[model samples]
Target: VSKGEELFTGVVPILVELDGDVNGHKFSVSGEGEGDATNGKLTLKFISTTGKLPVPWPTLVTTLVQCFSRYPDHMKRHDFFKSAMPEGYVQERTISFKDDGTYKTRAEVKFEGDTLVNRIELKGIDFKEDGNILGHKLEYNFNCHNVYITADKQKNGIKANFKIRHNVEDGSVQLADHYQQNTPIGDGPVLLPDNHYLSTCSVLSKDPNEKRDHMVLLERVTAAGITHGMDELYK
Candidate 1:
């Protein structure tokens, strides 16, 4: 397993609430658990439904959250993307940097037969004299799925907000809070929020067995959102 997998493994019981549609059918699902980050052990149930579902409704909802929320930075202590490529994979892409030290990157990723076009922007950057970054904001959008994030060292703590989209289902989940180095949650190299809340929106889903695959994809993309911020902002 890669370092990303290891980080995601330590965090559990991520709560989710979703309101949206699947295949034009309206539905909503909400649940939480310390799911098996490496498998399909993570699950969700339909809190309520007004329309017919194509498969087991709860399973479908579970699949959808896993698919949309699985970005590489899922449980990262800091905000930023340290590198461009996921572990052991390589592809060609275009990258541009602005005079103010902002980055605009574009890449085409092949997923089965689907070509996922990715656009990432890092802005509002402030730097330290040592070439490290002091603060910044990032927006990563892939195939209509978007993740918006912001981070900075504030008077309270290392403040940040993370928003990940489930565009296909018109839903999303957001972590809108700040984390202090020490809090109720155990503190260490891996940063868990001293206090946190997850906000989920819209909804939709699919096959049970295939849910794991979708989550793996979501995690990778979601994690990428902060690669740059993580590298530059932290010492």
Candidate 2:
């Protein structure tokens, strides 16, 4: 059944790694579904914690994001949820880079993959709100987690190799958004960054007829934030 990759249309960026044991109560889920190609919305962020609702880190992050937003096929009914690696499922993961490295992290995202969302730390994290989400002046850049597309704010089908290399390259740009343009990062308007970067699974379209098909996956480049923007790159 492994024939996935169809968010229907443009703006698709995703990643997953799942682990389970519902009855015995064992759990592990990953992060990001900020994916939205044309209406199948997902602005999630995650990293499950059982540190306790038997206590409260804010009710154990809302019961680990409402039980990881219910079993995979649990209602959303699989329209597009596969980064290819879902053959079977078992899990193990680890990540951390705090203390002056400035909290740029990734502890793990084994799978349950969505609606559930975050402890923050993908790459160079950037979320801007100039006004209401519907009011249109919002901007996002986790350039690290991949997936990028746009409409109302311009930046579209970009990937001139997402270039400007300070030292991050796979599919490229682990985090940088001065419109990711020193040069390289197609279709533009606010090429405004001297800098900004972080990371995540992402999808966006300010809705200008919403139809684009640009896809890319680069694994080895999954780590960054040395120094460019976003205040000396995270620390």
Candidate 3:
């Protein structure tokens, strides 16, 4: 982990929205979350859903919250990705400073017996005069084979892309989650009933959502997945 000042601390209520094109149907998910970066704990609730995608709300919500909860203070490039790959982990870090007073950082995270790799990069880091880090973009390229098992008892290769904007002001950030999966290497990518990409956004604040029993929901799901790696990552 990189040791330095953390981007966020204490508790912040993050209003999150996820837009997904599953198969080809368009869907949206909305939720409110609170995260304590100091203790690696987070809680979220799914308050609204739109469109006709049969997304398992509880599981999906829990997974998203869990992913953020694992962020450590002064998180390095590897630190964030490691949360998704808690079991098999290996990481390499690289840093370079530009003549234009901006710097870039990159991390390579390997998992699943070295078959899965996530290349993460942060570019154009600029610490503004007002103390906010701006102009930085977070990007991840996921390359893996047979990383997940489909419901039809088939192992699938998952190729995904994720991106986030790194900001210091603790407000909304842009995000993207796009992926394609295939079973048996040559059967073509398994398409959902509707093929669409997934995108997300989050806002930091102090107020909770109206429907706010998400803390309990998060606790229960986190405990259940601890002993089950498959469930932890996919369920």
- List clash counts for every candidate, in order: 22, 16, 6
Better of 2 and 3 by lDDT: 3
Ten-residue stretch with the least lDDT total in model 1: 177-186
Instruction: Pick out the ten consecutive residues of candidate 2 with the lowest summed lDDT.
Output: 53-62
Per-candidate local distance difference test = 0.28, 0.24, 0.30
| Candidate 2 structure quality by residue, lDDT tens digits, 1-235 | 1132232234444444333332133445454454442333344344444321111011111112111211122222221122212221111111111111111223222223422222222221122222111122213222223322221223211111121111222232222222211111222222221122223323322324423221122211111222434665555
- What candidate 1 gets wrong by more than 4 Å, as runs, is 1-30, 33-43, 49-144, 155-203, 206-221, 225-235
Q: Return the candidate ranking by lDDT, descending.
A: 3, 1, 2
Give the TM-score of each candidate. Answer: 0.26, 0.21, 0.31
* TM-score, candidate number 1: 0.26
- Residue-level lDDT of model 3, residues 121-197, one tens digit each, is 32323323232222333211111111111222234222323332332225533322222222222233322111112
What is the alpha-carbon lDDT for the whole of candidate 2? 0.24
Model 2 residue runs over 4 Å out of place are 6-41, 44-91, 97-235
